[PDB]
């Protein structure tokens, strides 16, 4: 069916919208910018004498293009067939690649959303989500990017994270206040993230091995993902997806670049609440994989050894988890989850190691208060 549909669509190029004609067309990115402008312009948006009575033309154009790129991405051939090397499949994929350029998709993903806010009184003001640019629109762009181009280059992965992913994650994190969480925009954005972005990053986990240079970038991603994980309005499936993605990424990330996320983990784990479940799994996996980096003085030959501040933080982490387990009443699941973590961190900590009496200063917990988490 996909082969027939793609052939018919390219046979009749008038079905691609004015932008993707190729006949003096401004391109997908410029078309969606024009659609944005239509969305802010009331005169050209409304009929200008309900949904049936008032249709937003900018949102309609946006949805049309989103549907078109979604359909083309779905029509794109499968990876197993393309690995088998079918000529018809590679032909179809090349035709789709010609149809949509990469820069246009990058620009559409880079385009940001309007942020609903609280008013002067404090009640949230919500722009009409049926009007304007919506996360489902970018969902199709991400689908096409994954199925047609595919993320197989670390440089392109980090460039996409620079331009369109990390800002979205940070906005979702910033919209985690109790009033702003309930907004339908937050629900839509969480849906988009947990259904399109995080699975893509999970499937692109090995590429994250070479992230030495963009340490700040990878740390920002980790912190944003962790903040989303502590966000409350998430559904169970959304939380599961976030946990899987974060564990997968931290699995192949290089050990010393855990340290920044570990610094945030250590003071939030001793609560041993329900939110503390997945930090425990992350810690267990990290310490089990990297115990050599901690135990042996040499550690991994390429990686080296700890900076000893990570060692002090890990020690206080171990002690906090131990005392919290001692105080907390026995819960079967919680205690079967914490036990491997406690044992793994104890094993990773060198028994011959001596704690330094010199404490650490500039405790970030003072700036990281309960409200807004900062």
């Amino acid at each position: 069916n996909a082969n027939v549909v793609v052939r018919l669509l390219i046979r009749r190029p008038e079905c691609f919208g004015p932008a993707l004609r190729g006949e003096g067309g401004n391109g997908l990115l410029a078309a969606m910018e024009e659609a944005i402008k239509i969305a802010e312009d009331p005169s050209r948006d409304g009929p200008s004498p309900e949904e049936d009575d008032t249709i937003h033309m900018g949102n309609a154009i946006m949805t049309f293009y989103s549907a078109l790129i979604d359909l083309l991405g779905r029509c794109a051939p499968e990876m197993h067939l393309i690995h088998a090397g079918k000529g018809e499949a590679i032909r179809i994929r090349s035709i789709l690649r010609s149809l949509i350029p990469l820069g246009d998709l990058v620009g559409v993903i880079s385009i940001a959303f309007q942020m609903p806010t609280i008013a002067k009184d404090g009640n949230v003001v919500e722009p009409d989500m049926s009007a304007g640019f919506c996360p489902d629109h970018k969902a199709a762009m991400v689908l096409f990017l994954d199925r047609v181009y595919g993320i197989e280059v670390q440089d392109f992965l980090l460039h996409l994270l620079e331009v369109g992913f990390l800002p979205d994650l940070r906005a979702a994190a910033s919209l985690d206040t109790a009033a702003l969480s309930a907004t339908d925009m937050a629900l839509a954005l969480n849906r988009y993230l947990c259904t399109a972005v995080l699975p893509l990053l999970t499937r692109c986990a090995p590429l994250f091995a070479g992230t030495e240079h963009h340490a700040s970038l990878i740390d920002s991603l980790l912190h944003t993902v962790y903040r989303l994980s502590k966000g409350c309005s998430l559904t169970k499936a959304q939380r599961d997806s976030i946990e899987v993605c974060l564990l997968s990424i931290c699995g192949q990330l290089r050990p010393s670049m855990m340290q920044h996320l570990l610094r945030r983990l250590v003071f939030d784990v001793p609560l041993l609440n329900e939110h503390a479940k997945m930090p425990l799994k992350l810690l267990t996996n990290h310490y089990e994989r990297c115990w050599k980096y901690y135990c042996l003085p040499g550690g991994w030959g390429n990686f080296g050894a700890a900076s000893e501040e990570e060692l002090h933080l890990s020690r206080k982490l171990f002690w906090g988890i131990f005392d919290a387990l001692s105080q907390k009443k026995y819960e079967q699941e919680l205690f079967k989850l914490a036990l491997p973590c406690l044992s793994a961190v104890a094993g990773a900590l060198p028994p011959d190691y001596m704690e330094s009496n010199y404490v650490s200063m500039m405790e970030k917990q003072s700036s990281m208060d309960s409200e807004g988490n900062f």
Binding site: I10, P13, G22, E23, G24, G27, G87, S94, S98, L99
Partner: protein
């Protein structure tokens, strides 16, 4: 009773243009040496500007079904509608294909069409399709038909782009009808008999002198005259002449006594012409009118005219023969005969006369394919390197 297009037949791809509301006939061409990109040469203006059919001619190597082509890729037949055909550029030897690169001439989707050395891959092959319902798929393609070509690799049509002021041939989703015109069929070509488009030397007299331009005097202006010269020049590219018939269709047909044509100096690229002052001067392509540059071959000095004879479609009858035949050059409009002024490294000036000397008979010598290719390469190289030098001078 109607000829059918088969393999090993020289063909040209004609198309129609409606520029400023006039019908213009153009042909898909490409100069294989240097720029591989294809362009279009105007053929409807044969009255004023000679068409460079030498780079327009194409030969059909194979015509196989899409199924057979796919099987082969996994590993004198007649063109039937629905096959994929392999075009080879006659002069250069490369094959027409979608270059998969684009000039971005107001069409992102369009792919440039050029020439490729290797026939492997799906880029070279072009599936052939009927233009209209009059001949369904599978039917034999007649010589006079309109055909649409779909690229195997890119699934686009050979399309004429009007977006820019200059017309471009590109692979596009919009389809343009192409007509295949048979230049010649080498299968039935008679050896030793002159055919149109052949590169030949006009030997003259018993001294075996040849109609050659002056030597490499470092001046294209000085290289515009013509004179008879004999000796080592006979084995040089300075004396090669291409006989281009005034007809586009069936141009490679055997030359008949009295056929009008133009003589093109291969090395200098100029066409032989007659001034009103009864002196021959080589002019450029733009100023090569039919009246100025048209010449005919006559068997004898007798002035009887055959009148107007119909041009026959097909290979034709072989009349003029190399070496054995004796020909006389007659200017079409002025009716004069080419002759030698005899005023004398012999450097005998060649003039035009309404009686001429008794010994105006000439012999025709074919040029080897390697020599012809080398002469064309020399011309196309000197042109580019002169443009380069002038640009550096500016």
């Amino acid at each position: 009773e109607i000829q059918f297009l088969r393999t090993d037949d020289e063909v040209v791809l004609q198309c129609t243009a409606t520029i400023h509301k006039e019908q213009q006939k153009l042909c898909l061409a490409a100069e294989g040496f240097g720029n591989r990109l294809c362009f279009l040469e105007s053929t409807s203006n044969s009255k004023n500007v000679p068409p460079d059919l030498s780079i327009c001619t194409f030969v059909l190597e194979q015509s196989l079904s899409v199924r057979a082509l796919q099987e082969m890729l996994a590993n004198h037949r007649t063109l039937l509608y629905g096959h994929a055909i392999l075009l080879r550029h006659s002069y250069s030897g490369m094959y027409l294909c979608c270059l998969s690169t684009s000039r971005s001439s107001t069409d992102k989707l369009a792919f440039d069409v050029g020439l490729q050395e290797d026939t492997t891959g799906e880029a070279c092959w072009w599936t052939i399709h009927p233009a209209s319902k009059q001949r369904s798929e599978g039917e034999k393609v007649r010589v006079g038909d309109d055909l649409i070509l779909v690229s195997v690799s890119s699934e686009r049509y050979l399309h004429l782009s009007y977006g820019n002021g200059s017309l471009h041939v590109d692979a596009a989703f919009q389809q343009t009808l192409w007509s295949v015109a048979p230049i010649s069929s080498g299968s039935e070509a008679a050896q030793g008999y002159l055919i149109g488009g052949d590169v030949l030397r006009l030997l003259h007299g018993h001294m075996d002198e040849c109609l050659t331009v002056p030597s490499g005097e470092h001046g294209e202006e000085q290289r515009r005259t013509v004179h008879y010269e004999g000796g080592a020049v006979s084995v040089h590219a300075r004396s090669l002449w291409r006989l281009e018939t005034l007809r586009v269709a069936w141009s490679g047909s055997h030359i008949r006594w009295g056929q009008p044509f133009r003589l093109r100096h291969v090395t200098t690229g100029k066409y032989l012409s007659l001034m009103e002052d009864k002196n021959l001067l080589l002019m450029d392509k733009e100023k090569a009118d039919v009246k100025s540059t048209a010449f005919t071959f006559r068997s004898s000095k007798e002035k009887l005219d055959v009148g107007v004879r119909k041009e026959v479609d097909g290979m034709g009858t072989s009349e003029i023969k190399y070496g054995d035949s004796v020909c006389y050059i007659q200017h079409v409009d002025t009716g004069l005969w080419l002759t030698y002024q005899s005023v004398d490294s012999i450097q005998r000036k060649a003039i035009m006369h309404h009686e001429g000397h008794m010994d105006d008979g000439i012999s025709l010598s074919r040029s080897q394919h390697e020599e012809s290719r080398t002469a064309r390469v020399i011309q196309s190289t000197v042109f580019l390197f002169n443009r380069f030098i002038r640009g550096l001078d500016a």
